Amino acid sequence: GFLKLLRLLLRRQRLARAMDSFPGPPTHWLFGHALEIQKTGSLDKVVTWTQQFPYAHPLWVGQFIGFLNIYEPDYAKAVYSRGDPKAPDVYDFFLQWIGKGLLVLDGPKWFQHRKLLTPGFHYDVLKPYVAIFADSTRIMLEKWEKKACEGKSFDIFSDVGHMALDTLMKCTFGKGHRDSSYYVAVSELTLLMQQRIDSFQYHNDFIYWLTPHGRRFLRACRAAHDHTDRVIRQRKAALQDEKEREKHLDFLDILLDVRGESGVQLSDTDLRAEVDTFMFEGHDTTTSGISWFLYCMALYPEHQQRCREEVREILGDQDSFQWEDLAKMTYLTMCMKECFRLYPPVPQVYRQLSKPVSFVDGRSLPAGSLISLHIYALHRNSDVWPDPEVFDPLRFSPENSSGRHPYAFIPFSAGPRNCIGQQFAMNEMKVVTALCLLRFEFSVDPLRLPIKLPQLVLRSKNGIHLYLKPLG
Numbered sequence: 001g002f003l004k005l006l007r008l009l010l011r012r013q014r015l016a017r018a019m020d021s022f023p024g025p026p027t028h029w030l031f032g033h034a035l036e037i038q039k040t041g042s043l044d045k046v047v048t049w050t051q052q053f054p055y056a057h058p059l060w061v062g063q064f065i066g067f068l069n070i071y072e073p074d075y076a077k078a079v080y081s082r083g084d085p086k087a088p089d090v091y092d093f094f095l096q097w098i099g100k101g102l103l104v105l106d107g108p109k110w111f112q113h114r115k116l117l118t119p120g121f122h123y124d125v126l127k128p129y130v131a132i133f134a135d136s137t138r139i140m141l142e143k144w145e146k147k148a149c150e151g152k153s154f155d156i157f158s159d160v161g162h163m164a165l166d167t168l169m170k171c172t173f174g175k176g177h178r179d180s181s182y183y184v185a186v187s188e189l190t191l192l193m194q195q196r197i198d199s200f201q202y203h204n205d206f207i208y209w210l211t212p213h214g215r216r217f218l219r220a221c222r223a224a225h226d227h228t229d230r231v232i233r234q235r236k237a238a239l240q241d242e243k244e245r246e247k248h249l250d251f252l253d254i255l256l257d258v259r260g261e262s263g264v265q266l267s268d269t270d271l272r273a274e275v276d277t278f279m280f281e282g283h284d285t286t287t288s289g290i291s292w293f294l295y296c297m298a299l300y301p302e303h304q305q306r307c308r309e310e311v312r313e314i315l316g317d318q319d320s321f322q323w324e325d326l327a328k329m330t331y332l333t334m335c336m337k338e339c340f341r342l343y344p345p346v347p348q349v350y351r352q353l354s355k356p357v358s359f360v361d362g363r364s365l366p367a368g369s370l371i372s373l374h375i376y377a378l379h380r381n382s383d384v385w386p387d388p389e390v391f392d393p394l395r396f397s398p399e400n401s402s403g404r405h406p407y408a409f410i411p412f413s414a415g416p417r418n419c420i421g422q423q424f425a426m427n428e429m430k431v432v433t434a435l436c437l438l439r440f441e442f443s444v445d446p447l448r449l450p451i452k453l454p455q456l457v458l459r460s461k462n463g464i465h466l467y468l469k470p471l472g
Ligand code: HEM
Pocket: 086, 102, 103, 104, 114, 277, 278, 281, 282, 283, 285, 286, 289, 344, 345, 346, 349, 350, 411, 412, 413, 416, 417, 418, 419, 420, 421, 422, 424, 425, 426
């Protein structure tokens, strides 16, 4: 016991000593910066800090843990190109929920899984998914036409979430109620876990699970685990009749190691972790992305009208979009990237340096130091983006992006730990969002504007309330 107290106090002095090269905002004697972080709009407060301290600034939860918040393309590249492990202080809070899956793994075992699961987001696996996206969206759009003609605005986030979760499971988990029960549990898990990240008194494992906060997290963990245990058994059992006919495997079948070709033999815990992991990752983010996009289309009726007639032309007289049609959606894509710049679905990720790093401006950090990549501020950096807060899709035209720094716009991160599902996501969001524009015209609700709420992914304190006009 005495050993551990000392272990921590030295680590904090170390972390502090390594960022003395980095000025930053004032620290409360107990809370560090937590009182600023916990305020509504703290993302914009970090953006102002960005302009007062260039490249990076220290960031403390509560006097024991301090990160170097980084928000500059060279600083990002210096760190996120290399593959240092995920910050244990943050990602260990995943353990009771998603465990040591791909997101949290740190080393040669991560590369094994990454090598195993990358096939499965290859475009030959994703080509059939286009039909499924279209079907899932048509169900959601059927409900929205009833809501629209009621004349009231309504929150689209939960509806998109239920559609995202359903399409994920039809595409990658074998699916051909209790699902809603899972959806509500993710909400609790991400809410609670985000609050744990921001609340230093909840950091210690032993203490945390004596608190109502931690117990509530554990009840949601069980709720999540029941869901993924059912998904696994349902598939294992469905492969008694249909194994011959499927044999380019989808994600869950790869894990189940049909054909014995994977040759890595996953444990039951490792299998359940990856299912847990990709079940959070493959729906929560695209829910945020799609929802925030449709809001952007409402905020800027010129841009969505352009997107609408673009996809209207691409579709023509087809029944549904084909995988080949997704490339033609060049203007939809640029509006989407500009949405993700301002409304990045994952605002903040973290690493713990395994090796020292030296930055472009001369400063450096030793191994063991904690990094906080602030994608939100990075995407609003005034030294990189003229008129940062302005929404201009033409920033991502072929001309204006030709010589842009590679780590300037990284909503899917970058490097060896980049998003594995990026092309899954991009394909899904383009199909969903294109069919949304062919079917409705979206407009703000001036009384109920969204307020940004970090919740691991980017959510809104009050949903995304929109008015929908049906279309011929
Ligand atoms: C799983 C999964 C990973 C981890 C890959 C690995 O560790 O090999 C992943 C990564 C990311 C990251 C980096 C996370 C970090 O730095 O801690 C970001 C920022 C991000 C963002 C988005 N992702 Fe993702 N992603 C994983 C899974 C998925 C899936 C699953 C099928 C989809 C779909 C997807 C989509 C998106 C997305 C879409 C709007 C954003 C933003 N990710 N991912």
